Amino acid sequence: MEAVQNRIVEAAERVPGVRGVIHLRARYVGQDIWAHMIIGVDPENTVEQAHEICEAVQAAVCGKIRRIESLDVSAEARE
Amino acid sequence: MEAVQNRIVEAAERVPGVRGVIHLRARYVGQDIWAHMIIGVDPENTVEQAHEICEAVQAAVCGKIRRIESLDVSAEARE
Numbered sequence: 001m002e003a004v005q006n007r008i009v010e011a012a013e014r015v016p017g018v019r020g021v022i023h024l025r026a027r028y029v030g031q032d033i034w035a036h037m038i039i040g041v042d043p044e045n046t047v048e049q050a051h052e053i054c055e056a057v058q059a060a061v062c063g064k065i066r067r068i069e070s071l072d073v074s075a076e077a078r079e
Numbered sequence: 080m081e082a083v084q085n086r087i088v089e090a091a092e093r094v095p096g097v098r099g100v101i102h103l104r105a106r107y108v109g110q111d112i113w114a115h116m117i118i119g120v121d122p123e124n125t126v127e128q129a130h131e132i133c134e135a136v137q138a139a140v141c142g143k144i145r146r147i148e149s150l151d152v153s154a155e156a157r158e
Contacts, residue, residue: 041126043126043130044125044126045125045126046123046124046126047120047154047155047156048123048156051155076130077126077127
């Protein structure tokens with residue numbers, strides 16, 4: 001649980017435009033993980049750019065961590 | 080319930096920068112309402128601007144509809 005959540009955080013942080021993981025809640029459903037994540041982004045990015053970063057984080061994390069079967073990613077301004 | 084939710088929607092829509100209410104969930108707790116709202120915004124607004132619109136919607140709706148005692152507002156790109 002703690003190691004998998006570190007893996008998730010690190011995976012998100014390596015995606016262009018991510019300025020920290022603000023929040024991550026992981027729920028275990030059988031052998032699978034269902035998760036909700038909030039990432040920080042540049043406040044001067046557009047809303048469209050922030051959506052693109054969130055989509056990229058979803059693809060990267062789901063592609064890298066095969067136990068994850070649901071992941072919702074949203075963004076907030078950071079710095 | 081239906082009339083109060085129409086009131087909430089209309090109140091949000093009159094705030095500068097709102098492009099529709101995408102989602103509104105209202106829960107009744109005793110006599111009070113607790114609500115979660117997603118607004119549409121210009122995709123070319125910055126993330127900081129979208130946060131400012133959300134804050135303005137929170138102030139307007141909470142100020143106008145006194146039964147609401149909790150309101151969380153987030154934004155997504157619309158058009």
